[PDB]
């Protein structure tokens, strides 16, 4: 009833496992359709084959930059950027899926998964989903990042698509 999508994660090519995310289209529909369409790839472009470029252990895993692969690109299904839809949902704990951005109303395609409650980001980043299964795979990816976010291994979304 809320869509579910999955990413299959690979570390330098070696399969790691699958993470599935429930997307709260009931509360943040524009934001959640944007992540759903990029996971299926149905508009022509999307997340398949891209990497997690910034992983800061004990905080969050960030990816979604499918154009420049380092945090300087990405785009939404609506344009380069779109507005912050609302701030109903908050960063209550691990598994929260929230949009990364560069300031007010600059959402594109980059997202991050919280591995901690990060209440200081409330009202600054739009929360739109959470880990349904595979939290242990997010924990395992977290072991490859560092204090400044550089990764030891290339963490890529080998495959991704919808499940519900």
């Amino acid at each position: 009833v809320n869509p579910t999508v999955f990413f299959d994660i690979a570390v330098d090519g070696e399969p790691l496992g699958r993470v599935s995310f429930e997307l709260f289209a009931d509360k943040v529909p524009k934001t959640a359709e944007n992540f759903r369409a990029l996971s299926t790839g149905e508009k022509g472009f999307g997340y398949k084959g891209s990497c997690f470029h910034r992983i800061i252990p004990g905080f969050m895993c960030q990816g979604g930059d499918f154009t420049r692969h380092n945090g300087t690109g990405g785009k939404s299904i609506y344009g380069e950027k779109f507005e912050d839809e609302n701030f109903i949902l908050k960063h209550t704990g691990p598994g929260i899926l929230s949009m990364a951005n560069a300031g007010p109303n600059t959402n594109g395609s980059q997202f991050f998964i919280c591995t901690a409650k990060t209440e200081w980001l409330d009202g600054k980043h739009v929360v739109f989903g959470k880990v349904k299964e595979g939290m242990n795979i997010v924990e395992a990816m977290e072991r490859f990042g560092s204090r400044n976010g550089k990764t030891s291994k290339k963490i890529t979304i080998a495959d991704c698509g919808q499940l519900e």
Side-chain angles (χ1 to χ4, degrees):
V1 186
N2 257 344
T4 296
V5 298
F6 66 91
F7 294 172
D8 272 330
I9 306 292
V11 180
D12 287 350
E14 309 282 34
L16 187 60
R18 172 171 285 189
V19 193
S20 59
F21 310 95
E22 188 186 321
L23 300 183
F24 307 128
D26 62 338
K27 285 167 232 73
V28 254
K30 208 197 182 185
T31 303
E33 169 62 1
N34 177 58
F35 191 93
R36 198 196 57 81
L38 293 167
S39 297
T40 66
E42 69 186 58
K43 305 298 187 289
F45 52 103
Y47 297 136
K48 186 166 180 161
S50 58
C51 73
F52 275 74
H53 60 275
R54 184 171 157 73
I55 296 184
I56 293 169
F59 181 22
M60 53 89 224
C61 299
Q62 189 177 301
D65 181 2
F66 61 81
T67 54
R68 203 150 308 263
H69 322 306
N70 62 0
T72 62
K75 58 166 71 296
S76 81
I77 61 160
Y78 308 114
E80 297 309 296
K81 64 62 187 169
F82 63 106
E83 70 268 28
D84 290 316
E85 186 167 18
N86 69 51
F87 297 103
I88 290 168
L89 307 161
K90 298 325 193 75
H91 304 70
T92 56
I96 285 298
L97 190 63
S98 188
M99 289 298 291
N101 60 47
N105 303 292
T106 59
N107 297 287
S109 54
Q110 299 186 47
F111 57 91
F112 54 100
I113 301 167
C114 300
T115 53
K117 175 182 118 296
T118 60
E119 77 296 335
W120 60 90
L121 301 170
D122 291 344
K124 307 168 178 166
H125 291 274
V126 185
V127 174
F128 66 100
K130 53 132 231 305
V131 169
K132 195 159 186 148
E133 294 160 82
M135 194 54 217
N136 59 314
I137 303 306
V138 180
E139 291 179 63
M141 300 161 53
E142 182 189 43
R143 320 284 156 254
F144 302 105
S146 52
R147 270 185 285 174
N148 68 340
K150 126 280 176 207
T151 52
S152 315
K153 267 53 232 56
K154 206 82 251 247
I155 307 301
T156 48
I157 303 178
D159 195 8
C160 57
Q162 197 170 338
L163 298 179
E164 167 199 341

